[PDB]
Amino acid sequence: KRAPAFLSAEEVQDHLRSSSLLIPPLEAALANFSKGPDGGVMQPVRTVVPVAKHRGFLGVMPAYSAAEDALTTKLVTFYEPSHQASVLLFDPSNGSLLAVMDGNVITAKRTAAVSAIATKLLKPPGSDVLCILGAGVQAYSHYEIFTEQFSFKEVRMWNRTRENAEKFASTVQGDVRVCSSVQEAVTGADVIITVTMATEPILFGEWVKPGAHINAVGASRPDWRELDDELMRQAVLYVDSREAALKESGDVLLSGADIFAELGEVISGAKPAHCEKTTVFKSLGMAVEDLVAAKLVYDSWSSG
Amino acid sequence: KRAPAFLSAEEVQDHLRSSSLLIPPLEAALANFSKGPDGGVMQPVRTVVPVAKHRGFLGVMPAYSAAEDALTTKLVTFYESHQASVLLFDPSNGSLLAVMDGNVITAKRTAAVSAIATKLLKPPGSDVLCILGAGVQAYSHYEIFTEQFSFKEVRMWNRTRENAEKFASTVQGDVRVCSSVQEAVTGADVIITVTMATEPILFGEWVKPGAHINAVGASRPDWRELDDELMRQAVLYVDSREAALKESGDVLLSGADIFAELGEVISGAKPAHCEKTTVFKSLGMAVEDLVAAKLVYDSWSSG
Numbered sequence: 001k002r003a004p005a006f007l008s009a010e011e012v013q014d015h016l017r018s019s020s021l022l023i024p025p026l027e028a029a030l031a032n033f034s035k036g037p038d039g040g041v042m043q044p045v046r047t048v049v050p051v052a053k054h055r056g057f058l059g060v061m062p063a064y065s066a067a068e069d070a071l072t073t074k075l076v077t078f079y080e081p082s083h084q085a086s087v088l089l090f091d092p093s094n095g096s097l098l099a100v101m102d103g104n105v106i107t108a109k110r111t112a113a114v115s116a117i118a119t120k121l122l123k124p125p126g127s128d129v130l131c132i133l134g135a136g137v138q139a140y141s142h143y144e145i146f147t148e149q150f151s152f153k154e155v156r157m158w159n160r161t162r163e164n165a166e167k168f169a170s171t172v173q174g175d176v177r178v179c180s181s182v183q184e185a186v187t188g189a190d191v192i193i194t195v196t197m198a199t200e201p202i203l204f205g206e207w208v209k210p211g212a213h214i215n216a217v218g219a220s221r222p223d224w225r226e227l228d229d230e231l232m233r234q235a236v237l238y239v240d241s242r243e244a245a246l247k248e249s250g251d252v253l254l255s256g257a258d259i260f261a262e263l264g265e266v267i268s269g270a271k272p273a274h275c276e277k278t279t280v281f282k283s284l285g286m287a288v289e290d291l292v293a294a295k296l297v298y299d300s301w302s303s304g
Numbered sequence: 305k306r307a308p309a310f311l312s313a314e315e316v317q318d319h320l321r322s323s324s325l326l327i328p329p330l331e332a333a334l335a336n337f338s339k340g341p342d343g344g345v346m347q348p349v350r351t352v353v354p355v356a357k358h359r360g361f362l363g364v365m366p367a368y369s370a371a372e373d374a375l376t377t378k379l380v381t382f383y384e385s386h387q388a389s390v391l392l393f394d395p396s397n398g399s400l401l402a403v404m405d406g407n408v409i410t411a412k413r414t415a416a417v418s419a420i421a422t423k424l425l426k427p428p429g430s431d432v433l434c435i436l437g438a439g440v441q442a443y444s445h446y447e448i449f450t451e452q453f454s455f456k457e458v459r460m461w462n463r464t465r466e467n468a469e470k471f472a473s474t475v476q477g478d479v480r481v482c483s484s485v486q487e488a489v490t491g492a493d494v495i496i497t498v499t500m501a502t503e504p505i506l507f508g509e510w511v512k513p514g515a516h517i518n519a520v521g522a523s524r525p526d527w528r529e530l531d532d533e534l535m536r537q538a539v540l541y542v543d544s545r546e547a548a549l550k551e552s553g554d555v556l557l558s559g560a561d562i563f564a565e566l567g568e569v570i571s572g573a574k575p576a577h578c579e580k581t582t583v584f585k586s587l588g589m590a591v592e593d594l595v596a597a598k599l600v601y602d603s604w605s606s607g
């Protein structure tokens with residue numbers, strides 16, 4: 001038995017600079033995962049252990065991928081540096097723990113990448129306007145990859161605290177139009193990203209342009225929601241994992257919306273991408289996404 | 305973020321030298337676990353992820369203890385070799401404080417819980433100890449049992465006789481190596497089964513009435529160390545009912561009824577029927593690793 005490598009957030013960052021290297025293996029993983037028993041992924045739905053005394057939670061997210069031949073576990077905490085994560089990478093041939101690495105950078109990057117994959121498939125024709133609700137870590141990681149991958153004529157932002165949206169707009173490279181309400185930000189928007197910690201709906205279907213695509217990334221708890229019933233039930237609903245969406249997403253559970261497809265099914269050709277219709281991609285994240293990122297990082301680090 | 309501490313196997317051993325210090329917090333943890341919600345332990349049943357391509361398995365064992373105010377996760381692999389690591393978090397903010405070897409922790413806490421069960425359940429006049437198996441668990445059980453108890457004779461059987469002789473010459477006191485399980489258990493007051501046998505090796509017919517058995521091996525729903533006569537005739541104690549019903553082939557395949565959790569005995573909710581033949585079926589649970597990891601981390605961080 002020997003000690004694992006430790007890779008800091010900076011070291012992870014140094015080995016995850018290129019979305020063109022992250023997107024392809026994510027697409028493959030989503031597809032393989034959605035094949036279920038016809039693929040090679042073993043991923044139990046995330047386990048959450050409450051830490052009631054301190055208003056905290058520990059998420060446990062193991063996965064094995066036969067196709068990548070990779071074995072990982074992400075451990076994530078949230079306390080009401082509030083979000084923290086670590087990823088463990090094992091030698092799949094003998095179980096040895098090879099690496100413990102920061103999970104924060106990975107969470108930022110793989111989440112944004114999965115949203116970008118969904119948007120490539122689901123954005124309507126004439127997607128000129130992007131709208132981001134929220135101004136935190138995920139707002140930044142999404143903005144980064146979306147402006148790399150796509151060309152929008154306008155990017156808009158609303159945030160609960162306007163000052164933080166204005167800081168965002170000052171910090172990032174391109175022009176961001178800070179809006180005074182959600183309604184203003186989303187009216188006329190073709191692609192929407194919701195990356196907030198809202199617990200009750202902030203985005204109402206009445207305001208959404210027919211055909212818009214929404215990446216619904218927040219409200220990551222079964223009692224929490226970012227979207228109203230009109231939007232959840234009017235939109236064609238795509239998810240990352242059916243099992244996770246029906247356990248963890250308040251938007252899905254409380255609206256009672258039918259799930260049309262997993263993103264992986266669209267990628268593999270099993271289900272259609274109805275980009276012309278108003279679409280919601282409800283994202284929860286899942287262990288195999290962390291596995292893909294951790295493997296990329298580890299392979300890059302270990303090869304020099 | 306601050307880098308976590310990494311504690312190797314030898315550093316863990318260096319900070320778990322005293323069973324005297326490990327037993328009391330384990331007793332409290334077992335009692336609190338068995339109290340259920342009001343005991344403050346959050347411990348989901350072990351998740352096992354198969355790695356079929358390499359004939360392996362990953363088990364993930366998280367726990368929170370309100371009483372100790374500690375948050376851990378053990379990750380263990382078994383490949384058809386067992387390797388474990390324990391992560392210890394700051395419970396107030398989720399920061400990863402330590403990554404430590406899990407093999408030494410597992411060896412120590414398992415032996416300690418067997419010792420707790422044995423203190424409660426060994427028959428009056430217990431003079432003879434028998435160990436079946438001769439691997440890591442045999443060593444840890446031997447160390448703590450000869451420290452906590454006073455046996456007049458210790459016997460051992462192992463499938464491979466050479467490894468039992470190596471054990472007998474390696475450990476401090478006298479060990480009588482026996483050529484069969486039956487020989488080793490005949491007349492024994494306390495028995496420890498620490499093998500990877502998949503089919504029964506220990507038959508109730510051979511067990512002295514009143515004997516206490518710590519059944520530590522066959523840690524899979526399709527594996528067994530004990531026969532039906534022993535499992536059905538003995539008073540059956542476990543660490544976790546839920547885990548025993550999911551993970552133990554001895555319990556599942558025999559159809560035996562579980563009398564009590566060890567924690568219920570400790571708290572007084574269930575009696576210790578030490579006069580009867582008793583089996584403590586140990587699966588292990590996350591809160592035991594939590595106790596040991598906290599003791600280790602606290603000792604190490606103190607200097």
Ligand SMILES: NC(=O)C1=CN([C@@H]2O[C@H](COP(=O)(O)OP(=O)(O)OC[C@H]3O[C@@H](n4cnc5c(N)ncnc54)[C@H](OP(=O)(O)O)[C@@H]3O)[C@@H](O)[C@H]2O)C=CC1
Nearest residue numbers: 134135136137138160161164195196197198218283284285
């Ligand atoms: N689908 C997935 O895979 C992943 C999901 N997430 C989820 O994404 C969301 C954003 O995460 P992250 O960027 O790291 O978090 P951050 O803490 O960095 O930012 C949180 C954002 O939510 C806003 N906010 C907090 N409370 C409310 C509220 N009551 N109403 C409206 N906005 C609010 C904040 O605004 P303000 O400036 O006013 O404080 C801020 O813009 C979270 O819900 C998170 O759980 C994260 C990663 C994985």
Ligand SMILES: NC(=O)C1=CN([C@@H]2O[C@H](COP(=O)(O)OP(=O)(O)OC[C@H]3O[C@@H](n4cnc5c(N)ncnc54)[C@H](OP(=O)(O)O)[C@@H]3O)[C@@H](O)[C@H]2O)C=CC1
Nearest residue numbers: 437438439440441463464467498499500501521586587588
């Ligand atoms: N209840 C709990 O909390 C814990 C449970 N365990 C379980 O305890 C047992 C021992 O673990 P450990 O000491 O680490 O393992 P080791 O690998 O160190 O030793 C294995 C032992 O099992 C024997 N053995 C292997 N196959 C058979 C067989 N078919 N029949 C009879 N004996 C056999 C070996 O004998 P030989 O020399 O001939 O190979 C050896 O004595 C295992 O079953 C393990 O899963 C351990 C961790 C915690």
Ligand SMILES: N[C@@H](Cc1cc(I)c(Oc2ccc(O)c(I)c2)c(I)c1)C(=O)O
Nearest residue numbers: 048057058059076077078220221248285
């Ligand atoms: N959503 C991000 C960050 C995040 C992680 C965790 I653990 C969180 O706590 C809970 C609490 C109860 C639950 O039932 C669930 I599901 C999650 C929250 I709120 C957010 C991620 O997945 O990393």
Ligand SMILES: N[C@@H](Cc1cc(I)c(Oc2ccc(O)c(I)c2)c(I)c1)C(=O)O
Nearest residue numbers: 352361362363380382386523524551588
């Ligand atoms: N018993 C020791 C070591 C150990 C750990 C693991 I993961 C093992 O593999 C499986 C495979 C399928 C299962 O259903 C179960 I339950 C366990 C085995 I065999 C042994 C411990 O608990 O650490």
Ligand SMILES: [K+]
Nearest residue numbers: 211212275279
């Ligand atoms: K659309």
Ligand SMILES: [K+]
Nearest residue numbers: 514515578582
């Ligand atoms: K007894």
